[PDB]
Design a protein around this ligand. Structure first.
Ligand SMILES: CN1CCN(c2nc3ccccc3s2)CC1
Ligand SMILES: CN1CCN(c2nc3ccccc3s2)CC1
Ligand SMILES: CN1CCN(c2nc3ccccc3s2)CC1
Ligand SMILES: CN1CCN(c2nc3ccccc3s2)CC1
Ligand SMILES: [Zn+2]
Ligand SMILES: [Zn+2]
Ligand SMILES: [Zn+2]
Ligand SMILES: [Zn+2]
Lengths: 360, 360
């Protein structure tokens, strides 16, 4: 059975379990069950399932080199699929809430969930809460007897917390740290002294890399009972590295990829986000360019945004990106080599993860 | 050491742990640590701590009848305090998000957290996410070696899920179930056919009773390793019963308690909530009264709200409340008697919980 075919089949099974449980144990009525079914499909489906499929792919790699009864192979693949859906539903939670938090309009060519006419923000915040609650329902049901349940739940929590801390770093990245204060309305930075590579890397590490790369890789190891085949410090280093490159690509696409391709109108400039483009531009601009950036960044005015986009183009950030990518390619390959020491199979899975990231 | 004194001391210890961990493991800077410290204090402190103290009180009851070394008594009391704070932080999460969802203005005489000038909804949604994440950080840290960790985490999840499902029932309680549809903007019911005692009881059971009564009582049993001293079906029945009475009191106060005493301006009428007052009024109104209620309920117009308040007063719902309370007093006492069969100590703790609920 092909990997994606199995993964999608498990979605239907998990969805049926969750909705049937809501009827048998939570007194749900059929119309609310239908609401939640539509909410699940709308928020969890339609992507490429890269995070969930990484769990499956890691587990398949170990299956090829480990002796098991057929029923055990099937159990491991089913576990990897459920775990992959835990990650996809966790991402769904983040995307629903982030879209509300940022006042976003579109995601993947369709309206953000909170903007659907019969949803609204009042329901959508709670729908997002439910999406994350469903990840825990999945784990306690499907993994109740598994030796890895404890380690999996502990990992999932730590990843979730790191991601929420990362969201805090992201939403406050255009403030001056010394001015943060619940009592005082927050002005945008004027000096941009905190738009540095180290601060950018901290934002991205926490807001993206734990749930997009560390979680799927480690969950694949856990459902495979293979965490001893790897040096965990190496898995963390390579996950944070690939994850940062993934976010840098996203940052570049927000500015330069056409809306129809992006599936949304990017507003990192109007939102004054600490993007890779802003940080890298400031790391090479002269005094006049810095001043013109300061006069235009973080404003909704289309003329001011266009000015920022000119400044980026004229700064030849394409060359900086090729240099960054060359260094990431160098460093990921080095970490993969270190991973072959204890597991050529896992190192090959990481290699596949990197190719899928690098090509898109 | 007095119970409340110990409970508050543990707050400072937990807060110090969480913030110190954010510095040592999450790369936090001192200004964001201060933001989160203020957010924690503002959202978690200032109430009566009834839920958290119930854990402590249940554990103290067992301590009085169970042989332990002194260090073990101290460990149990510390565990009960941490568990109580897990519940208070979970409530803090719900209140932050509910206030955003409902567009609330005040809570306990102070602005809702999202309305603080340097917070805003963009930060406050995530602050609420962090509050719940902190409950899991607490459990995995303080209870890492405890035999009850698994049972406690599983219970906490189920309670959280039931509460989120309850919030869905609450926010959709003024819609017609057959009309729910993400694609279509939701009109308020016109027939109010779903304002029934059974439907009201389902809302309250899920939205309030699991986290306010079932969770503190069962957590007290868990940290005491005393779940065998009770019939769990009885604990559930008494928790749901007391919890419903608690919410009925809240519903009555929303309408009739002065704002300065309530700590907010109640808007259940303008919000068209399925309150105990609306359900009970419809369960005794004549045809003309039903019509006048339909013409006025769920509108912000102060004259229409006053009309609804007149209809309630003229309907003598005070008599219905005294009848409801008399029946609850009857039924709680019956369940306490059944609880004495296996544990007079736990039955006495439940009795204390009921008195604290009944008097306020
Ligand atoms: C690729 N982006 C990574 C950061 N994302 C987050 N959204 C939330 C929402 C709530 C809590 C944490 C996070 S992190 C948005 C998508
Ligand atoms: C006609 N436009 C020319 C410039 N655009 C850019 N692509 C990148 C990629 C990486 C970093 C910066 C840029 S700017 C593409 C479309
Ligand atoms: C006494 N009320 C019980 C119901 N409350 C809830 N708020 C939320 C928020 C998010 C998820 C679930 C719930 S339940 C508000 C206070
Ligand atoms: C001057 N007002 C008289 C009526 N108010 C009510 N108190 C309750 C309590 C339980 C049920 C209904 C009502 S109406 C108190 C203040
Ligand atoms: Zn965002
Ligand atoms: Zn982006
Ligand atoms: Zn509410
Ligand atoms: Zn209320």
């Amino acid at each position: 059975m092909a990997s994606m075919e199995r993964f999608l089949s498990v979605y239907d099974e998990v969805q049926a379990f969750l909705l049937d449980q809501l009827q048998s144990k939570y007194e749900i009525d059929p119309n609310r069950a239908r609401y939640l079914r539509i909410m699940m499909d709308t928020t969890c489906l339609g992507g490429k399932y890269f995070r969930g499929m990484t769990v499956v792919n890691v587990a398949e790699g170990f299956l090829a080199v480990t002796q098991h009864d057929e029923a055990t192979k099937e159990r491991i693949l089913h576990d990897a699929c459920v775990g992959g859906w835990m990650i996809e539903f966790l991402q769904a939670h983040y995307l629903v809430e982030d879209d509300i938090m940022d006042g976003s309009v579109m995601r993947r060519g369709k309206p953000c969930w909170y903007r659907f006419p019969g949803v609204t923000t009042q329901c959508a915040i709670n729908d997002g809460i439910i999406l994350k609650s469903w990840t825990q329902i999945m784990a306690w049901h499907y993994f109740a007897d598994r030796p890895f349940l404890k380690d999996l739940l502990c990992l999932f929590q730590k990843v979730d917390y790191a991601t929420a801390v990362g969201q805090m770093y992201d939403v406050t990245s255009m403030c001056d740290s010394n001015k943060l204060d619940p009592e005082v309305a927050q002005p945008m930075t004027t000096d941009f002294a905190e738009f540095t590579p180290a601060i950018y890397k901290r934002i991205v590490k926490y807001k993206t890399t734990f749930y997009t790369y560390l979680l799927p890789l480690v969950m694949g190891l856990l459902v495979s009972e293979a965490a001893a085949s790897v040096e965990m410090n190496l898995v963390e280093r390579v996950a944070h590295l690939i994850g940062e490159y993934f976010q840098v690509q996203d940052d570049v696409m927000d500015c330069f990829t056409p809306p129809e391709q992006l599936g949304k109108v990017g507003t990192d400039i109007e939102d004054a986000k600490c993007s890779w483009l802003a940080v890298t531009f400031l790391g090479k601009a002269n005094a006049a360019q810095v001043a013109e950036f300061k006069a235009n960044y973080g404003e909704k005015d289309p003329a001011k945004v266009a000015v920022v986009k000119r400044l980026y183009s004229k700064a030849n950030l394409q060359a900086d990106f090729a240099a960054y990518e060359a260094e990431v390619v160098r460093e990921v390959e080095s970490l993969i080599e270190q991973l072959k020491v204890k597991s050529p199979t896992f190192a090959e899975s990481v290699a596949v993860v990197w190719e899928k990231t690098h090509k898109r």
